[PDB]
Amino acid sequence: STGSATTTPIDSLDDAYITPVQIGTPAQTLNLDFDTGSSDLWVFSSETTASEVDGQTIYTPSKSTTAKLLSGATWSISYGDGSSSSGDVYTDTVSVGGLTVTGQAVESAKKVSSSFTEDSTIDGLLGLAFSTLNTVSPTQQKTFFDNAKASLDSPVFTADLGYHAPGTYNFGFIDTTAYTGSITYTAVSTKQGFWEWTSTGYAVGSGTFKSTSIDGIADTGTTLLYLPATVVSAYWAQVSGAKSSSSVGGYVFPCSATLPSFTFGVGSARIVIPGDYIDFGPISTGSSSCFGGIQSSAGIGINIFGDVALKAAFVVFNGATTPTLGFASK
Ligand SMILES: C#CCN(C)Cc1nc([C@]2(O)CN[C@@H](c3nc(-c4ccc(Br)cc4)no3)C2)cs1
Numbered sequence: 001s002t003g004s005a006t007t008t009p010i011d012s013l014d015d016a017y018i019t020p021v022q023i024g025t026p027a028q029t030l031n032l033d034f035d036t037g038s039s040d041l042w043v044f045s046s047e048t049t050a051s052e053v054d055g056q057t058i059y060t061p062s063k064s065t066t067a068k069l070l071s072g073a074t075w076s077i078s079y080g081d082g083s084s085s086s087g088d089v090y091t092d093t094v095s096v097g098g099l100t101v102t103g104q105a106v107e108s109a110k111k112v113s114s115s116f117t118e119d120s121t122i123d124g125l126l127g128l129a130f131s132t133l134n135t136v137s138p139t140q141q142k143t144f145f146d147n148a149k150a151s152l153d154s155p156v157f158t159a160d161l162g163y164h165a166p167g168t169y170n171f172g173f174i175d176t177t178a179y180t181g182s183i184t185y186t187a188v189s190t191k192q193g194f195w196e197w198t199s200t201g202y203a204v205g206s207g208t209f210k211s212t213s214i215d216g217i218a219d220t221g222t223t224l225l226y227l228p229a230t231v232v233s234a235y236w237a238q239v240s241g242a243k244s245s246s247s248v249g250g251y252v253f254p255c256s257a258t259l260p261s262f263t264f265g266v267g268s269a270r271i272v273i274p275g276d277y278i279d280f281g282p283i284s285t286g287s288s289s290c291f292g293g294i295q296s297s298a299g300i301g302i303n304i305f306g307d308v309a310l311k312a313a314f315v316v317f318n319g320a321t322t323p324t325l326g327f328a329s330k
Pocket residue numbers: 016033035036037038078079080081083115116119122125219220221222299300301302
């Protein structure tokens with residue numbers, strides 16, 4: 001089997017991408033944030049504390065003929081921004097882009113933190129990291145991909161995120177029309193539960209390439225590109241007036257600037273992030289200070305190839321017995 005679904009930016013900055021997911025019978029369609037950096041499929045629901053729901057579409061398990069309480073199971077998760085959610089668990093039929101998993105754990109939120117409430121466009125998350133990170137207790141649950149894997153034509157999914165435009169998540173096949181050149185595959189470590197790999201270096205703008213190993217994770221659920229402070233400083237040093245602002249929480253730059261590209265290495269191949277992809281616009285409405293799309297990982301303990309990087313590429317998440325990541329230009 002295969003599936004194919006369109007993913008759409010939630011706003012004009014590409015802060016996140018949402019993909020429609022069918023849950024239950026009859027289908028209840030919720031728009032979920034596919035997150036290769038976590039492993040829980042959780043939704044706003046009829047159980048979510050009413051004051052914490054503000055415009056989201058909710059899953060109502062009592063209206064699904066295929067829903068079953070996963071008795072005694074609970075879940076609780078926090079994300080890198082400090083947001084969190086928790087609740088109980090149903091199993092139900094879940095379909096993405098025509099690909100169906102029966103008995104998928106659907107984690108129903110009883111509580112969500114303020115950043116989730118405030119984002120009316122995100123109805124929940126669909127985790128696509130390794131199932132060893134799933135938070136359901138006492139019986140850990142598998143991701144949608146892990147459950148689908150054995151049925152897929154090939155044990156892969158691909159992320160083809162757009163820049164200020166929709167893109168595609170495919171399951172079970174590689175769309176050879178969706179990229180240019182070849183896909184370069186690179187080894188993955190699953191030891192931390194992430195799609196963790198080692199970039200071979202970077203370049204700023206038209207500069208020469210610096211060969212240096214950069215461990216990090218491919219994370220569709222993170223907006224920005226978080227890299228070591230040395231690399232990030234070398235990038236922003238090329239932008240007049242750019243500086244790290246403790247009050248804003250990262251590098252800002254004059255909105256009057258044109259930004260240089262940023263290249264990262266994948267083996268002997270290179271992915272070039274256009275400068276415009278690094279512009280996240282005014283820090284507040286009307287400001288002439290703009291927020292940078294490349295930020296230091298120093299406070300977080302891990303480098304993160306988030307959407308800024310991934311949307312410059314066609315990315316293969318190969319979940320074969322030895323997992324690998326593939327990157328192609330597009
Ligand atoms: C600090 C620190 C150390 N590490 C915990 C950093 C890491 N963080 C991760 C994620 O938590 C998983 N994917 C990202 C993600 N964030 C979301 C999200 C959050 C809020 C809202 Br509102 C909507 C979506 N979805 O995915 C970040 C992996 S490693």
